[PDB]
């Protein structure tokens, strides 16, 4: 029984790296809802309440759902009746609107595959902002750290020219998770008459064409490096 547990823990170690979800504790509860009316082809009602206390790669979750199973001799169906999400305050605050949508839609399989895709773009963000901070420590400053809502670049000796980059995550009803890269500029009114080519009006639309052609990280490193290296003064 130490050897029969020893290959099941390898199956727990394989599915924690495959599905990305480690379940810490689980409870099993059986309640019976068998009706007391006599009829032909009698239906056994199986109500199973489960508590899923597990975590993702960085965030945790808590589930409370019951499933009413319909056992009948002609057809086989089972309906998920009640959903409940017990949430904690985390380092992201834009995923709370999906909590109210999943409670109305009552599809917990949409809740499991989209929040792992939410961390899959967020673990890309932890590898990108580690690269952007340690390479340029004097120009790229992050206000809430790498778990922020937006990032900006600020020059050291030039305190008036800034460029902020907002990276939001929106989830539609098609089951996909898509980012949205938008640019906002911080230029005061003294350089408005010094610019006559009007590139600051068409500045977010030219920034999204660098995303679809060069990439996400290749567009972010092009706005940091080409803004620099003016070493005449």
């Amino acid at each position: 029984l130490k050897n029969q547990l020893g290959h099941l823990e390898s199956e727990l170690s394989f599915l924690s790296t495959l599905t990305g979800i480690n379940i810490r504790n689980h409870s099993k509860q059986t309640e019976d809802l068998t009706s007391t009316e006599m009829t032909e082809k009698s239906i056994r009602k199986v109500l199973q309440r489960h508590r899923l206390s597990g975590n993702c790669h960085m965030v945790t979750f808590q589930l409370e759902f019951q499933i009413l199973e319909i056992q009948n001799k002609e057809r086989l169906s089972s309906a998920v009746t009640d959903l409940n999400i017990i949430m904690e305050p985390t380092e992201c605050s834009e995923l709370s609107e999906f909590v109210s949508r999943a409670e109305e839609r009552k599809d917990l399989f949409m809740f499991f595959r989209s929040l792992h895709f939410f961390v899959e773009w967020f673990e890309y963000r932890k590898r990108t902002f580690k690269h952007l901070k340690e390479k340029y420590p004097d120009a790229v400053y992050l206000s809430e750290g790498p778990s922020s809502c937006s990032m900006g670049i600020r020059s050291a000796s030039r305190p008036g020219f800034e460029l902020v980059i907002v990276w939001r995550i929106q989830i539609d009803e098609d089951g996909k998770v898509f980012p949205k890269l938008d640019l906002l500029t911080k230029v005061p009114q003294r350089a408005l008459e010094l610019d006559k080519n009007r590139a600051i009006e068409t500045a977010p639309l030219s920034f999204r064409t660098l995303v679809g052609l060069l990439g996400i990280e290749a567009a972010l490193e092009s706005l940091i490096k080409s803004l620099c290296a003016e070493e005449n003064n």
Binding site: F161, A191, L194, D195, N197, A199, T202, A203, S206, T209, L210, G212, L213, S222, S226, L227, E230
Partner: protein, 52 residues
């Protein structure tokens, strides 16, 4: 010999469909690539001359 003529032009009809279909999409991509690269070279030159 006309049914053998009809079956080979129809064989040449399916021989000529997909490679001008995929080079229509590659012409649509390369026109989208050049119009994005010229608008980004106009954008990056105007932002460095704003920086000077």
């Amino acid at each position: 010999k006309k049914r053998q003529r009809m079956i080979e032009v129809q064989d040449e009809l399916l021989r000529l469909e997909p490679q001008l279909k995929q080079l229509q999409t590659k012409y649509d991509e390369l026109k989208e690539r050049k119009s994005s690269l010229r608008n980004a070279a106009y954008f990056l030159s105007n932002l460095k001359q704003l920086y000077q």
